[PDB]
Design a protein around this ligand. Structure first.
Ligand SMILES: Nc1ncnc2c1ncn2[C@@H]1O[C@H](COP(=O)(O)OP(=O)(O)NP(=O)(O)O)[C@@H](O)[C@H]1O
Ligand SMILES: Nc1ncnc2c1ncn2[C@@H]1O[C@H](COP(=O)(O)OP(=O)(O)NP(=O)(O)O)[C@@H](O)[C@H]1O
Ligand SMILES: Cn1cnc2c(F)c(Nc3ccc(Br)cc3F)c(C(=O)NOCCO)cc21
Ligand SMILES: [Mg+2]
Ligand SMILES: [Mg+2]
Lengths: 311, 274
């Protein structure tokens, strides 16, 4: 719309003010987070005064592969959407890859979920809109697919934006990542755990699992106990086995509308083809409704974090 | 009491992090490797098992075994082990792409079994054998690090050590992967890892080169659906060797050989060769 076109064009403006990205041009302010693969810092780019986030992935790969990674990451200069995190530049130095991206002062919904305990369906409604729009922009305009939707990779800021990031744009980085140490929990849809990515559908499973996890405040595999639910340590291999050989999770009985409960149920169908696609979810009841609602997302966020109301 | 006060170790440049620590190049009557463990505040019940394990690890001495020098609990819990010059086997095979003659490949395999055979002889399960934990001192001798240490690799609850399972997944035996069949870590689980390392040496590749999904490997290897593709073994590799690799990789652990037999096989084909 108009406020989005303003914001999108304002980014490209600040982006031209940044030239070559050298490691000496950055001053470290604060840490933002870390995962099992990278560490992210809030930083100020001295030549341009901007403030960005700088993820630092430390891979031990051969330099031929690493140079193709950097080269492939430069497609991120083409992703320009209000639902995709802004990208300033990637480069290599001191043995680490740097991806420099726009700073999202709300954080990832994984952090925000811990500060909130649960997230209200009215909010999640607006979140589902953004994720669906974001996967869409990735599937049509670039014919690439996310491959890692989970609450850690949905980012949110004080202007009420909800953007995707950390999507698989670099083919060689996907390969390189697959020599990782084991994680504690998976968002991988059951076909990918036996076969390969079944187009955008398998991103959609993860979105559903992320919605449930956030709606209830708890990793939903295995689904909550009988009395842990009225209160409203599994092996990684067993979770993967549970995802393939057990019925998918579902929302609680009476706490959420029926339109929302159906939406996630359409997302968590074990067959990727019977599962719903983007055009289906795009005109679902729960999305039709959550789009009409005038939810104040920016304020709900600043409240939840403990920052004073914005605007 | 194999402890070390704070002021003794000169901690230096941060090198990198692994499955259960972060390594720094330190000083302690010479260059050491200081690995700052992950389990920060340990249990007095955990701490006594860690001390007990250090006792077993201090009494280990072999030409192919990184010397264990002891530990320090002062600022944070830490491990002090011999520092190695030069690169790990992982770097040589997969980063530097060092062009060893096939005769030296077999010799790297021989010394590694040689070293594993000693750990097993002293009833020590490595739990983390991989080319990242094999260094090549002076581009000659093989040196195995990061062995044992079960108690600080599997964080506790109070008096219960339960391996939540960590490490790089490519070398994990299936029964290890599943984490169900009682004590999953065993001599044969190391033999399996050793097999994966053979796969490295014989192919110049990591296994599952066409799978680029961590959890997909974990599920399929653990369900017996996935197996390293032995096709990829380079053409100039001994037949007697490829058959040895396949014995270590048996999906059922009980079919795998032990290192006495393994080391035997490699020396036999080492002699009878040029
Ligand atoms: N551009 C950004 N702005 C603000 N916070 C960010 C940004 N990028 C990442 N973060 C946060 O900092 C952390 C970065 O971790 P990240 O490398 O994405 O791993 P992760 O997604 O949390 N988990 P994993 O995928 O297993 O490595 C996350 O917890 C995010 O919440
Ligand atoms: N004793 C050592 N001397 C010199 N370099 C070392 C030593 N131990 C580890 N390193 C290096 O330090 C970095 C981190 O090592 P480490 O924490 O052991 O990770 P890892 O070996 O890859 N996986 P794991 O050993 O199972 O945790 C790597 O670059 C190693 O090659
Ligand atoms: C496997 N794969 C293939 N392409 C990738 C990529 F472009 C990534 N980055 C990335 C992408 C878009 C934005 Br907008 C910002 C980013 F930083 C990441 C990543 O960051 N994964 O997080 C791991 C924990 O560090 C992973 C990729
Ligand atoms: Mg992330
Ligand atoms: Mg090591």
């Amino acid at each position: 719309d108009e406020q989005q076109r303003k914001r999108l064009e304002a980014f490209l403006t600040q982006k031209q003010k940044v030239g070559e990205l050298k490691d000496d041009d950055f001053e470290k302010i604060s840490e933002l987070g870390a995962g099992n693969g990278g560490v992210v810092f809030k930083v100020s780019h001295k030549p341009s005064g901007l403030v960005m986030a700088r993820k630092l992935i430390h891979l031990e790969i051969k330099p031929a592969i690493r140079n193709q990674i950097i080269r492939e990451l430069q497609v991120l200069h083409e992703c320009n959407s209000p639902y995709i995190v802004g990208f300033y530049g990637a480069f290599y130095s001191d043995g680490e890859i740097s991806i420099c991206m726009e700073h999202m002062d709300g954080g990832s919904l994984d952090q925000v979920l811990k500060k909130a305990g649960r997230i209200p369906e009215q909010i999640l409604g607006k979140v589902s809109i953004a994720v669906i729009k974001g996967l869409t922009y990735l599937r049509e305009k670039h014919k690439i697919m996310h491959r890692d939707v989970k609450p850690s990779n949905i980012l949110v800021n004080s202007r009420g934006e909800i953007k995707l990031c950390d999507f698989g744009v670099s083919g060689q980085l996907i390969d390189a990542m697959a020599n990782a140490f084991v994680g504690t929990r998976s968002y991988m849809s059951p076909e990918r755990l036996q076969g390969t990515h079944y187009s955008v559908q398998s991103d959609i499973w993860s979105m559903g699992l992320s919605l449930v996890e956030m709606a209830v405040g708890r990793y939903p595999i295995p689904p909550p106990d009988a009395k842990e639910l009225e209160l409203m340590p599994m092996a990684i291999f067993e979770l993967l086995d549970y995802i393939v050989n057990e019925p998918p999770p579902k929302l609680p009985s009476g706490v959420f509308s029926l339109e929302f409960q159906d939406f996630v149920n359409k997302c968590l169908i074990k067959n990727p083809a019977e599962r719903a696609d983007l055009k289906q979810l795009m005109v679902h009841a729960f999305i039709k409704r959550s789009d009409a609602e005038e939810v104040d997302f920016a304020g709900w966020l600043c409240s939840t974090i403990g920052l004073n109301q914005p605007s | 009491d194999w402890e070390i006060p704070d002021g003794q170790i000169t901690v230096g440049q941060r090198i990198g992090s692994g499955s259960f620590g972060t390594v720094y190049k330190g000083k302690w009557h010479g260059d050491v490797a200081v690995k700052m463990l992950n389990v920060t505040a340990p249990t007095p019940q955990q701490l006594q098992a860690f001390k007990n394990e250090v006792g077993v690890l201090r009494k280990t001495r072999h030409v192919n075994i990184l010397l264990f020098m002891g530990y320090s609990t002062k600022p944070q819990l830490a491990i002090v082990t011999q520092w190695c010059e030069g690169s790990s086997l992982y770097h040589h095979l997969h980063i530097i792409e060092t062009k060893f003659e096939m005769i030296k490949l077999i010799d790297i395999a021989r010394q590694t079994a040689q070293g594993m055979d000693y750990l097993h002889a002293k009833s020590i399960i490595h739990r983390d054998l991989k080319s990242n934990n094999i260094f090549l001192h002076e581009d000659l001798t093989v040196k195995i690090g990061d062995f044992g240490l079960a108690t600080v690799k599997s964080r506790w609850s109070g008096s219960h050590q339960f391996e939540q399972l960590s490490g790089s997944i490519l070398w994990m035996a299936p029964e290890v992967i599943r984490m169900q069949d009682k004590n999953p870590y065993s001599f044969q689980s190391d033999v399996y890892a050793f097999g994966i390392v053979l796969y490295e040496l014989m192919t110049g590749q990591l296994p599952y080169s066409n799978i680029n999904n961590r959890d997909q490997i974990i599920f399929m290897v653990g369900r017996g659906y996935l197996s390293p593709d032995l096709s990829k073994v380079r053409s100039n590799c001994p037949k007697a060797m490829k058959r040895l690799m396949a014995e270590c990789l048996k999906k059922k652990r009980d079919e795998r050989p032990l290192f006495p037999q393994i080391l035997a096989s490699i020396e036999l084909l080492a002699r009878s060769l040029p």
